[PDB]
Amino acid sequence: ATINNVTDLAIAAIQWSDRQDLTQELLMLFIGNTTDRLNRLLRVRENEHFETLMAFGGGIEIPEHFVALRSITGDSLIGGRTLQYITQDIFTHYVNYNYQPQGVTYYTRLGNFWRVFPVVPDGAPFIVNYWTVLPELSLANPTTWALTKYPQIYLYGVLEQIYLYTMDEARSQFWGQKLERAVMELQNEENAADFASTRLAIKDIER
Amino acid sequence: ATINNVTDLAIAAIQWSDRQDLTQELLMLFIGNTTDRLNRLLRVRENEHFETLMAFGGGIEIPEHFVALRSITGDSLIGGRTLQYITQDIFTHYVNYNYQPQGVTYYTRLGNFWRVFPVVPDGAPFIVNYWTVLPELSLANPTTWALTKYPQIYLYGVLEQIYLYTMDEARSQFWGQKLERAVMELQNEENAADFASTRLAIKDIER
Amino acid sequence: ATINNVTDLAIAAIQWSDRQDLTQELLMLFIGNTTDRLNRLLRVRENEHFETLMAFGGGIEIPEHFVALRSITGDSLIGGRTLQYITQDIFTHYVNYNYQPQGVTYYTRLGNFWRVFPVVPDGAPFIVNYWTVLPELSLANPTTWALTKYPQIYLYGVLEQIYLYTMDEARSQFWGQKLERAVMELQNEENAADFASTRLAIKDIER
Amino acid sequence: ATINNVTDLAIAAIQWSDRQDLTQELLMLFIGNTTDRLNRLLRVRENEHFETLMAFGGGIEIPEHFVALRSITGDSLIGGRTLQYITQDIFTHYVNYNYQPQGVTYYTRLGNFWRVFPVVPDGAPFIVNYWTVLPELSLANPTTWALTKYPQIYLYGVLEQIYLYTMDEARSQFWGQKLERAVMELQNEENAADFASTRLAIKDIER
Amino acid sequence: RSITGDSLIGGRTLQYITQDIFTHYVNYNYQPQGVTYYTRLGNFWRVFPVVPDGAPFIVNYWTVLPELS
């Protein structure tokens, strides 16, 4: 609907800005800038992936497209528990004192790796659920879910970038405010779509 | 009543804006933008659908037009209860400790699926009541319930989009404020239409 | 993506600022100034290094690229504990009174060295995790992780430097605010990437 | 990196200020003024010196480049304690009443000397850790650590001095604010580099 | 009036740039997709993304009046 691919977005931007001097490279740069700005703000269902990873050398390697972490779950063969975050001091104390819980329970971050306390042999599987970065929008990849969901976001971002390029201040701020409002609306709608109309009761666990 | 289909809306927009240089494609883009903006705000009776889904692989697939969830109810053969939301930690703790309630009682969101705790065999029926997105308004779909219910919303949205296109600010803000007021009025009337004139007493349940 | 190397950044700066009198040396100076400014603000995953160091003369030599310290951990052969910071007076009192703890436990800073209280013989290994400075971007080093992760930071910094050079105030403040906002967004995302969506429980250690 | 020596700094100042009437003497005066201003504010690792001094005539001579004192420690031959500051009245009372502690414990300042209470024979060694003044920057000494670390400080200081010389007000304040911000950033980064990311416990001593 | 590239070589309407911009683009290896820029040197129009010989262009311009004799 509305904007279907990158070419339609470029045509709409040219029509709305009324600037015939824009080349393909500048439009691609503007679209890339908008996508990179979006990468730091959006955490939605379409941005979420869960997959199975293997533990090597007592640690799990962070995925290359990782931006934020939702959950890490052990496999049923090693307990099947949801891991909890601990600091380095707690990790060291637990290792030194031989805490010995039932299964893999805790994790921490060292460098580019996640280290689990009850050190497991190599090949232990884990289920990691995490958010990733938005797909690239360009001539090679002319369609993305972000464009198909809320095209106003990309349109307003491109317009703001264009007016930034032509050394204009007021219109750039106007379009930036519009883009921020659209992004906030989308994020709030995604946030309130799970349990905003149901009942909550508080449950008790033991970890 | 008042505005009947897309052609009347386009004619009214042309007459009110007094702009004879607006092509069909620009008007379609404006209408699509207004509909997309409305999709994130309205939660009314006409936007609400309830239907029966089948659970496969211990999960329920979210519908493609889903925007917000109202309720999930198990079928009478598997308990006939209303599910309650729980987090991932509670889910995995219940699975590990074999909580074993009477029937399907809890649900959680993983990826694009809803997982129920008392895992059921494939083919379990559920009744899901949820809100969808507004129907697409175009030449192929000349009439929608949104246009018939309150045409001023679409008229004001199209006018605001037009004045945004022609690089104007004050009139755009004026029409945007008018559209927001109309949307708020409609939403409030829909909200206060069920029990705003009756008596409430508070009841006790057990879950 | 977007901007890939230093030459693309220079071309983009030339196009956006619309200044044909900028030589290569001025652009290199602007980029270097932006890098030095970033060196005092960013503490992210790509800036983190952990490595093994030898204790010579009862002290550990601070690395030359060190900017901030994250943790120091003794090797398992000498206790395998996470060191804690103490002042000079506490160190002197512990030395005088022969405190005699189990293993290496405390550290302090003297000059350009880290001194550990349970004095160890020369050659004791430690694991130091710390932050370093960003790689220098120039003709000899055309690609860095900072440019690839978020090109808007470098673009806005270079533009701000350019407008500072041409004796302009309003545009310089504008671009400085944009750069600061981008840096804050990146830092906040990196800060929240770890455990902003998990559960915390508070644990007890012994030190 | 960026600015490597004094000549490059002078060239950059001439280019940025766009003033061809500046002579070598004026530039050296500006650089000296900036260094003198910096000497009153910076207390960093590179400014720190610890060395052994011999007490003569019951006192220790203050070093000629001393700007601020960090610590004074007695040698292990005379107790190896960290001295504490006392006023003149306490010193006189302790001398008169023959307090007689174990080793050298207290010190005070008289004129240009540090006097220790448990008067020791001449030749007693002490370890003094203190801050000095920044090295001079001129033709004879064209490279200093301060220029290498954060060249923006010197560049902004020289620009502010230049605009002060030409009887301008707004630009001088602008560049002075920039220089102050840079100095504050450097000082904060140096301050938070020791234990801002570790744990603190509070320990007990006896003095 | 106008210069346009052939669709095979990019099909872009060329834009005028000065000599300094041309030199900067050449030195920094801008490398766009097709031919986009041009400048005037002597009696020639030089296009920036240097193309091998035999690249057709469509030029629209004004001529002199025909001779009456």
Short mmCIF file of all heavy atoms in Angstrom, two decimals, chain A residues 30 33 36-37 40 43 66-67 69-70 84-85 88-90 92-93 96-97 106-107 109 111 136 160 164, chain C residues 1-2 16 45 48 73 79-82 150 152 174 178 185 189 193-195 197 199 201 203 205-207:
data_model
loop_
_atom_site.label_atom_id
_atom_site.label_comp_id
_atom_site.label_asym_id
_atom_site.label_seq_id
_atom_site.Cartn_x
_atom_site.Cartn_y
_atom_site.Cartn_z
N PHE A 30 20.56 9.58 2.05
CA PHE A 30 19.50 10.00 2.96
C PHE A 30 18.74 8.80 3.52
O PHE A 30 18.45 8.74 4.73
CB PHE A 30 18.53 10.94 2.25
CG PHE A 30 19.17 12.18 1.70
CD1 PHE A 30 18.62 12.83 0.61
CD2 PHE A 30 20.30 12.71 2.29
CE1 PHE A 30 19.19 13.98 0.11
CE2 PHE A 30 20.88 13.86 1.79
CZ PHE A 30 20.33 14.49 0.70
N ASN A 33 20.87 7.06 6.09
CA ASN A 33 20.91 7.81 7.34
C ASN A 33 19.63 7.60 8.14
O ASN A 33 19.68 7.41 9.36
CB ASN A 33 21.13 9.29 7.06
CG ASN A 33 22.59 9.67 7.05
OD1 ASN A 33 23.44 8.93 7.53
ND2 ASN A 33 22.89 10.84 6.50
N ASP A 36 19.79 4.08 9.67
CA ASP A 36 20.68 4.02 10.82
C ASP A 36 20.09 4.72 12.03
O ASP A 36 20.28 4.25 13.16
CB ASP A 36 22.05 4.62 10.48
CG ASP A 36 22.84 3.76 9.51
OD1 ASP A 36 23.34 2.70 9.94
OD2 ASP A 36 22.99 4.15 8.34
N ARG A 37 19.39 5.84 11.83
CA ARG A 37 18.72 6.48 12.95
C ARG A 37 17.65 5.57 13.54
O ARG A 37 17.50 5.48 14.76
CB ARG A 37 18.11 7.81 12.51
CG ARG A 37 17.24 8.47 13.56
CD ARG A 37 17.93 9.68 14.15
NE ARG A 37 17.36 10.06 15.44
CZ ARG A 37 16.45 11.01 15.60
NH1 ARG A 37 15.99 11.70 14.57
NH2 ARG A 37 16.00 11.28 16.82
N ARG A 40 18.56 2.57 16.14
CA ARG A 40 18.82 2.83 17.55
C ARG A 40 17.55 3.04 18.36
O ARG A 40 17.64 3.29 19.56
CB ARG A 40 19.72 4.05 17.70
CG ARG A 40 20.85 4.13 16.69
CD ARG A 40 22.14 3.60 17.27
NE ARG A 40 22.42 2.24 16.83
CZ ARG A 40 22.89 1.92 15.63
NH1 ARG A 40 23.14 2.85 14.72
NH2 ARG A 40 23.11 0.65 15.33
N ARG A 43 12.26 -1.35 18.61
CA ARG A 43 12.31 -2.71 19.18
C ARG A 43 10.90 -3.27 19.05
O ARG A 43 10.07 -3.09 19.95
CB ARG A 43 12.79 -2.71 20.62
CG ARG A 43 14.03 -1.86 20.88
CD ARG A 43 15.29 -2.63 20.55
NE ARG A 43 16.48 -1.85 20.85
CZ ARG A 43 17.13 -1.10 19.97
NH1 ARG A 43 16.72 -1.01 18.72
NH2 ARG A 43 18.21 -0.43 20.36
N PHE A 66 23.46 -8.35 16.35
CA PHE A 66 22.82 -8.14 17.64
C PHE A 66 22.81 -6.66 18.00
O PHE A 66 23.81 -5.96 17.84
CB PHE A 66 23.57 -8.95 18.70
CG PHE A 66 23.24 -8.58 20.11
CD1 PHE A 66 22.22 -9.21 20.78
CD2 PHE A 66 23.97 -7.61 20.78
CE1 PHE A 66 21.92 -8.88 22.08
CE2 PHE A 66 23.67 -7.27 22.07
CZ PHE A 66 22.65 -7.91 22.73
N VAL A 67 21.67 -6.19 18.49
CA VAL A 67 21.53 -4.83 19.00
C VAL A 67 21.06 -4.82 20.45
O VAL A 67 21.58 -4.04 21.27
CB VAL A 67 20.60 -3.98 18.11
CG1 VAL A 67 19.23 -4.62 17.98
CG2 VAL A 67 20.48 -2.57 18.67
N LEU A 69 19.30 -7.60 23.71
CA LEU A 69 19.04 -8.97 24.13
C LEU A 69 17.72 -9.04 24.88
O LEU A 69 17.44 -8.21 25.74
CB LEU A 69 20.17 -9.49 25.02
CG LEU A 69 19.87 -10.81 25.75
CD1 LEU A 69 19.87 -11.96 24.77
CD2 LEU A 69 20.88 -11.05 26.85
N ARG A 70 16.91 -10.04 24.54
CA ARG A 70 15.64 -10.28 25.21
C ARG A 70 15.72 -11.40 26.23
O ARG A 70 15.30 -11.23 27.38
CB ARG A 70 14.54 -10.58 24.20
CG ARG A 70 13.14 -10.55 24.78
CD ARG A 70 12.11 -10.23 23.72
NE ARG A 70 10.76 -10.24 24.25
CZ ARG A 70 9.89 -11.23 24.07
NH1 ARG A 70 10.21 -12.31 23.37
NH2 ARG A 70 8.68 -11.14 24.60
N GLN A 84 20.15 -15.70 34.34
CA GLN A 84 20.11 -14.43 35.04
C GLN A 84 21.47 -13.74 34.97
O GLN A 84 22.51 -14.40 34.91
CB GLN A 84 19.71 -14.62 36.51
CG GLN A 84 19.19 -13.36 37.17
CD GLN A 84 18.62 -13.63 38.55
OE1 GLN A 84 19.28 -14.22 39.40
NE2 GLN A 84 17.38 -13.20 38.77
N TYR A 85 21.45 -12.42 34.96
CA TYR A 85 22.67 -11.64 34.82
C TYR A 85 23.35 -11.44 36.17
O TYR A 85 22.69 -11.13 37.17
CB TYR A 85 22.37 -10.28 34.19
CG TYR A 85 23.59 -9.41 34.01
CD1 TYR A 85 24.45 -9.61 32.94
CD2 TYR A 85 23.90 -8.41 34.92
CE1 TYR A 85 25.57 -8.82 32.77
CE2 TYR A 85 25.01 -7.62 34.76
CZ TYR A 85 25.85 -7.83 33.69
OH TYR A 85 26.96 -7.05 33.52
N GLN A 88 30.90 -9.39 37.38
CA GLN A 88 32.15 -10.15 37.35
C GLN A 88 32.55 -10.63 38.74
O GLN A 88 33.05 -11.75 38.90
CB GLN A 88 33.26 -9.31 36.73
CG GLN A 88 34.63 -9.95 36.78
CD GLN A 88 34.82 -10.97 35.67
OE1 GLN A 88 33.94 -11.18 34.84
NE2 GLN A 88 35.99 -11.61 35.66
N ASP A 89 32.35 -9.79 39.76
CA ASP A 89 32.73 -10.17 41.11
C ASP A 89 31.94 -11.38 41.60
O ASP A 89 32.50 -12.30 42.20
CB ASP A 89 32.54 -9.00 42.07
CG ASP A 89 33.05 -7.70 41.49
OD1 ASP A 89 32.69 -7.38 40.33
OD2 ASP A 89 33.82 -6.99 42.18
N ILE A 90 30.63 -11.39 41.34
CA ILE A 90 29.80 -12.52 41.73
C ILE A 90 30.24 -13.78 40.99
O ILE A 90 30.31 -14.87 41.57
CB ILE A 90 28.32 -12.21 41.48
CG1 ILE A 90 27.89 -10.99 42.29
CG2 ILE A 90 27.46 -13.41 41.84
CD1 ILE A 90 26.55 -10.43 41.89
N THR A 92 33.26 -14.49 39.84
CA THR A 92 34.52 -14.96 40.39
C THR A 92 34.32 -15.62 41.75
O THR A 92 34.91 -16.68 42.03
CB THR A 92 35.50 -13.79 40.50
OG1 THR A 92 36.11 -13.56 39.22
CG2 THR A 92 36.59 -14.09 41.52
N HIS A 93 33.49 -15.03 42.60
CA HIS A 93 33.24 -15.62 43.91
C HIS A 93 32.57 -16.98 43.78
O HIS A 93 32.93 -17.93 44.49
CB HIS A 93 32.38 -14.68 44.76
CG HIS A 93 31.70 -15.36 45.91
ND1 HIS A 93 32.40 -15.97 46.93
CD2 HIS A 93 30.39 -15.51 46.21
CE1 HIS A 93 31.54 -16.47 47.80
NE2 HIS A 93 30.32 -16.21 47.39
N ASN A 96 35.15 -19.51 42.65
CA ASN A 96 36.12 -19.84 43.69
C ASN A 96 35.51 -20.71 44.78
O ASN A 96 36.17 -21.62 45.29
CB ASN A 96 36.69 -18.56 44.29
CG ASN A 96 37.83 -17.99 43.49
OD1 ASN A 96 38.26 -18.59 42.50
ND2 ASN A 96 38.34 -16.84 43.90
N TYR A 97 34.25 -20.46 45.14
CA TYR A 97 33.64 -21.15 46.27
C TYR A 97 32.88 -22.41 45.87
O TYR A 97 32.33 -23.07 46.76
CB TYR A 97 32.70 -20.20 47.02
CG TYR A 97 33.39 -19.41 48.10
CD1 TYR A 97 34.63 -18.83 47.89
CD2 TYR A 97 32.79 -19.23 49.34
CE1 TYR A 97 35.26 -18.10 48.87
CE2 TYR A 97 33.41 -18.50 50.33
CZ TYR A 97 34.64 -17.94 50.09
OH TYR A 97 35.27 -17.22 51.08
N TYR A 106 23.27 -18.70 35.51
CA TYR A 106 23.72 -17.32 35.45
C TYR A 106 24.61 -17.10 34.24
O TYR A 106 25.24 -18.03 33.72
CB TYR A 106 24.47 -16.93 36.73
CG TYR A 106 23.70 -17.23 37.99
CD1 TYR A 106 24.05 -18.29 38.80
CD2 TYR A 106 22.62 -16.45 38.37
CE1 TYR A 106 23.35 -18.57 39.95
CE2 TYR A 106 21.92 -16.72 39.52
CZ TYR A 106 22.29 -17.78 40.31
OH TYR A 106 21.59 -18.05 41.46
N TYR A 107 24.66 -15.85 33.80
CA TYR A 107 25.51 -15.45 32.69
C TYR A 107 26.04 -14.05 32.94
O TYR A 107 25.45 -13.26 33.68
CB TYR A 107 24.76 -15.51 31.36
CG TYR A 107 23.86 -14.32 31.11
CD1 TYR A 107 24.27 -13.27 30.30
CD2 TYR A 107 22.61 -14.23 31.70
CE1 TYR A 107 23.46 -12.18 30.08
CE2 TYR A 107 21.80 -13.15 31.49
CZ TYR A 107 22.22 -12.13 30.67
OH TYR A 107 21.41 -11.04 30.45
N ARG A 109 28.81 -10.89 30.79
CA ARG A 109 29.38 -10.46 29.52
C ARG A 109 30.86 -10.16 29.69
O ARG A 109 31.24 -9.37 30.56
CB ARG A 109 28.65 -9.23 28.97
CG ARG A 109 28.67 -9.14 27.46
CD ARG A 109 28.56 -7.70 27.00
NE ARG A 109 29.87 -7.09 26.82
CZ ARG A 109 30.23 -5.92 27.34
NH1 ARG A 109 29.39 -5.21 28.07
NH2 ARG A 109 31.45 -5.46 27.12
N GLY A 111 34.06 -9.16 27.06
CA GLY A 111 34.45 -8.88 25.69
C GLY A 111 33.26 -8.97 24.77
O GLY A 111 32.26 -8.27 24.93
N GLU A 136 18.69 -3.48 5.13
CA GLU A 136 19.12 -2.38 4.29
C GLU A 136 18.11 -2.12 3.18
O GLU A 136 17.57 -3.05 2.58
CB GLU A 136 20.49 -2.68 3.68
CG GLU A 136 21.41 -1.48 3.60
CD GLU A 136 21.95 -1.08 4.95
OE1 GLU A 136 22.97 -1.66 5.38
OE2 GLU A 136 21.36 -0.18 5.58
N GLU A 160 13.31 15.31 5.90
CA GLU A 160 14.16 15.99 6.87
C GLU A 160 15.61 16.00 6.43
O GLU A 160 16.30 17.02 6.54
CB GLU A 160 14.02 15.34 8.25
CG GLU A 160 14.69 16.10 9.36
CD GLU A 160 15.49 15.20 10.28
OE1 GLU A 160 15.67 14.02 9.94
OE2 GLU A 160 15.93 15.68 11.35
N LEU A 164 17.89 19.23 5.50
CA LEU A 164 19.19 19.41 6.13
C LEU A 164 20.27 19.65 5.08
O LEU A 164 21.18 20.46 5.28
CB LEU A 164 19.54 18.20 6.98
CG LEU A 164 19.16 18.25 8.45
CD1 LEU A 164 19.72 17.04 9.18
CD2 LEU A 164 19.65 19.53 9.08
N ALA C 1 28.00 0.09 4.97
CA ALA C 1 26.90 0.74 4.26
C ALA C 1 26.99 2.25 4.41
O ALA C 1 27.79 2.75 5.20
CB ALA C 1 25.56 0.24 4.78
N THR C 2 26.16 2.97 3.65
CA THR C 2 26.14 4.42 3.65
C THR C 2 27.52 4.98 3.31
O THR C 2 27.87 5.11 2.14
CB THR C 2 25.66 4.96 5.00
OG1 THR C 2 24.66 4.09 5.53
CG2 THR C 2 25.07 6.35 4.84
N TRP C 16 27.98 18.51 1.20
CA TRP C 16 27.01 19.09 2.12
C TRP C 16 27.37 20.52 2.49
O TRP C 16 26.50 21.40 2.50
CB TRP C 16 26.89 18.23 3.38
CG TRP C 16 26.10 16.98 3.18
CD1 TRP C 16 26.26 16.05 2.20
CD2 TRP C 16 25.00 16.53 3.99
NE1 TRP C 16 25.34 15.04 2.35
CE2 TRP C 16 24.56 15.31 3.44
CE3 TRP C 16 24.36 17.03 5.12
CZ2 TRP C 16 23.50 14.60 3.98
CZ3 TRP C 16 23.31 16.32 5.66
CH2 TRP C 16 22.89 15.11 5.09
N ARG C 45 31.32 -1.75 23.39
CA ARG C 45 31.88 -3.09 23.26
C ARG C 45 33.10 -3.10 22.35
O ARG C 45 34.11 -3.75 22.65
CB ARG C 45 30.82 -4.05 22.72
CG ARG C 45 30.12 -4.85 23.80
CD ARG C 45 29.12 -5.82 23.19
NE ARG C 45 27.89 -5.15 22.78
CZ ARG C 45 27.43 -5.12 21.54
NH1 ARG C 45 28.07 -5.72 20.55
NH2 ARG C 45 26.30 -4.47 21.29
N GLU C 48 36.52 -2.18 23.93
CA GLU C 48 36.90 -2.96 25.10
C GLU C 48 37.93 -4.01 24.72
O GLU C 48 37.75 -4.74 23.74
CB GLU C 48 35.67 -3.63 25.71
CG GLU C 48 35.69 -3.74 27.22
CD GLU C 48 34.60 -4.64 27.75
OE1 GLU C 48 33.41 -4.28 27.60
OE2 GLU C 48 34.92 -5.70 28.30
N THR C 73 41.67 -9.12 37.27
CA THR C 73 41.43 -10.43 37.86
C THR C 73 42.75 -11.18 37.96
O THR C 73 43.46 -11.32 36.97
CB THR C 73 40.42 -11.23 37.04
OG1 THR C 73 39.13 -10.62 37.15
CG2 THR C 73 40.34 -12.66 37.54
N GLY C 79 45.18 -17.19 43.18
CA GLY C 79 43.94 -16.93 43.87
C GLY C 79 42.74 -16.81 42.94
O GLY C 79 41.64 -17.25 43.29
N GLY C 80 42.95 -16.23 41.77
CA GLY C 80 41.85 -16.06 40.83
C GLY C 80 40.74 -15.17 41.34
O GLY C 80 39.56 -15.50 41.16
N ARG C 81 41.08 -14.06 41.97
CA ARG C 81 40.10 -13.16 42.56
C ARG C 81 40.04 -11.85 41.78
O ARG C 81 40.97 -11.49 41.05
CB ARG C 81 40.44 -12.88 44.02
CG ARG C 81 40.34 -14.09 44.92
CD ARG C 81 41.11 -13.88 46.21
NE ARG C 81 40.25 -13.36 47.26
CZ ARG C 81 40.14 -13.90 48.47
NH1 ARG C 81 40.82 -14.98 48.81
NH2 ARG C 81 39.33 -13.33 49.36
N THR C 82 38.93 -11.14 41.95
CA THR C 82 38.75 -9.82 41.36
C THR C 82 39.24 -8.77 42.34
O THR C 82 38.76 -8.71 43.48
CB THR C 82 37.29 -9.59 41.00
OG1 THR C 82 36.89 -10.51 39.97
CG2 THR C 82 37.08 -8.17 40.50
N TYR C 150 28.07 3.93 12.70
CA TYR C 150 27.18 5.08 12.74
C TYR C 150 27.81 6.26 12.02
O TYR C 150 28.41 7.14 12.67
CB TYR C 150 26.85 5.44 14.19
CG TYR C 150 25.49 6.05 14.40
CD1 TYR C 150 24.55 6.08 13.39
CD2 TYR C 150 25.15 6.60 15.63
CE1 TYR C 150 23.31 6.64 13.59
CE2 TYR C 150 23.91 7.17 15.83
CZ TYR C 150 22.99 7.18 14.81
OH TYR C 150 21.76 7.74 15.02
N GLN C 152 26.70 8.95 10.75
CA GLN C 152 26.19 10.29 11.03
C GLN C 152 27.05 11.01 12.05
O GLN C 152 27.18 12.24 11.98
CB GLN C 152 24.75 10.20 11.53
CG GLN C 152 23.88 9.21 10.80
CD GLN C 152 22.44 9.27 11.25
OE1 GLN C 152 22.11 9.97 12.20
NE2 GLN C 152 21.58 8.54 10.56
N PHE C 174 24.31 24.35 15.81
CA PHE C 174 23.33 23.41 15.28
C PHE C 174 23.96 22.03 15.06
O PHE C 174 23.46 21.01 15.56
CB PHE C 174 22.76 23.96 13.98
CG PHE C 174 21.66 23.14 13.39
CD1 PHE C 174 20.38 23.21 13.91
CD2 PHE C 174 21.89 22.32 12.31
CE1 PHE C 174 19.36 22.46 13.36
CE2 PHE C 174 20.88 21.57 11.76
CZ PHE C 174 19.61 21.64 12.29
N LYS C 178 23.46 18.32 16.95
CA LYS C 178 23.15 17.07 16.24
C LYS C 178 24.15 15.98 16.58
O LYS C 178 23.77 14.83 16.85
CB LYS C 178 23.12 17.31 14.73
CG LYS C 178 22.24 18.47 14.30
CD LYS C 178 20.78 18.07 14.22
CE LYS C 178 20.59 16.86 13.34
NZ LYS C 178 19.16 16.65 13.00
N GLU C 185 22.61 8.90 21.72
CA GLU C 185 21.79 7.76 21.29
C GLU C 185 22.61 6.48 21.23
O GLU C 185 22.19 5.43 21.74
CB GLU C 185 21.15 8.06 19.94
CG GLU C 185 19.97 9.01 19.99
CD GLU C 185 19.42 9.34 18.62
OE1 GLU C 185 20.13 9.10 17.62
OE2 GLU C 185 18.28 9.84 18.54
N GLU C 189 22.08 3.20 23.69
CA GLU C 189 21.78 1.88 23.14
C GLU C 189 22.79 0.85 23.63
O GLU C 189 22.41 -0.25 24.04
CB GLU C 189 21.77 1.93 21.61
CG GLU C 189 21.67 0.56 20.97
CD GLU C 189 22.36 0.50 19.63
OE1 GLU C 189 23.58 0.20 19.60
OE2 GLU C 189 21.70 0.73 18.60
N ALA C 193 21.93 -2.40 26.02
CA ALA C 193 21.94 -3.64 25.26
C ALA C 193 22.09 -4.88 26.13
O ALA C 193 21.70 -5.97 25.70
CB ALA C 193 23.06 -3.61 24.22
N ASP C 194 22.63 -4.75 27.34
CA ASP C 194 23.04 -5.92 28.11
C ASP C 194 21.89 -6.57 28.88
O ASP C 194 21.55 -7.73 28.63
CB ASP C 194 24.17 -5.54 29.07
CG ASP C 194 25.49 -6.15 28.67
OD1 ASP C 194 25.55 -6.79 27.60
OD2 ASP C 194 26.47 -5.99 29.42
N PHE C 195 21.29 -5.85 29.83
CA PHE C 195 20.32 -6.45 30.73
C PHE C 195 19.10 -5.56 30.96
O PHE C 195 18.47 -5.65 32.02
CB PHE C 195 20.97 -6.80 32.07
CG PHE C 195 21.70 -5.66 32.70
CD1 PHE C 195 21.03 -4.72 33.47
CD2 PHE C 195 23.07 -5.52 32.54
CE1 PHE C 195 21.70 -3.67 34.05
CE2 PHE C 195 23.74 -4.47 33.12
CZ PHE C 195 23.06 -3.54 33.88
N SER C 197 16.28 -5.82 29.62
CA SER C 197 15.06 -6.59 29.45
C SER C 197 15.15 -7.95 30.14
O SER C 197 14.55 -8.92 29.69
CB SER C 197 14.72 -6.77 27.97
OG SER C 197 14.96 -5.57 27.25
N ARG C 199 15.88 -9.98 34.33
CA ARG C 199 15.52 -9.88 35.74
C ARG C 199 16.78 -9.84 36.59
O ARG C 199 17.77 -10.51 36.30
CB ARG C 199 14.65 -11.06 36.16
CG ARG C 199 13.58 -11.43 35.14
CD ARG C 199 12.30 -10.66 35.39
NE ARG C 199 12.31 -9.35 34.75
CZ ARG C 199 11.99 -9.14 33.48
NH1 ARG C 199 11.62 -10.13 32.69
NH2 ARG C 199 12.04 -7.90 32.99
N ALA C 201 18.28 -9.79 40.80
CA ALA C 201 17.89 -10.40 42.06
C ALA C 201 18.74 -10.05 43.27
O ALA C 201 18.32 -10.36 44.39
CB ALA C 201 17.86 -11.93 41.92
N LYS C 203 22.74 -10.48 44.75
CA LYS C 203 23.44 -11.63 45.29
C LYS C 203 24.44 -11.18 46.34
O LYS C 203 24.87 -10.02 46.37
CB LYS C 203 24.15 -12.43 44.19
CG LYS C 203 23.31 -12.64 42.95
CD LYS C 203 22.04 -13.39 43.27
CE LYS C 203 21.53 -14.15 42.06
NZ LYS C 203 20.10 -14.52 42.21
N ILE C 205 28.16 -11.73 48.24
CA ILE C 205 29.52 -12.24 48.08
C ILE C 205 30.27 -12.08 49.39
O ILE C 205 29.71 -11.60 50.38
CB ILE C 205 30.25 -11.54 46.92
CG1 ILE C 205 30.52 -10.08 47.27
CG2 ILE C 205 29.45 -11.65 45.64
CD1 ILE C 205 31.74 -9.52 46.58
N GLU C 206 31.54 -12.47 49.41
CA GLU C 206 32.33 -12.47 50.63
C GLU C 206 33.50 -11.50 50.60
O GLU C 206 33.95 -11.07 51.67
CB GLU C 206 32.87 -13.88 50.91
CG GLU C 206 34.25 -14.18 50.33
CD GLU C 206 34.29 -14.16 48.81
OE1 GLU C 206 33.22 -14.11 48.17
OE2 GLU C 206 35.40 -14.19 48.24
N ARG C 207 34.00 -11.14 49.42
CA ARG C 207 35.19 -10.30 49.26
C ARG C 207 36.39 -10.86 50.02
O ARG C 207 36.58 -10.60 51.21
CB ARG C 207 34.90 -8.87 49.72
CG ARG C 207 36.09 -7.93 49.58
CD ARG C 207 36.52 -7.80 48.13
NE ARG C 207 35.51 -7.14 47.31
CZ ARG C 207 35.36 -7.33 46.01
NH1 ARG C 207 36.14 -8.16 45.34
NH2 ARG C 207 34.40 -6.68 45.37
#
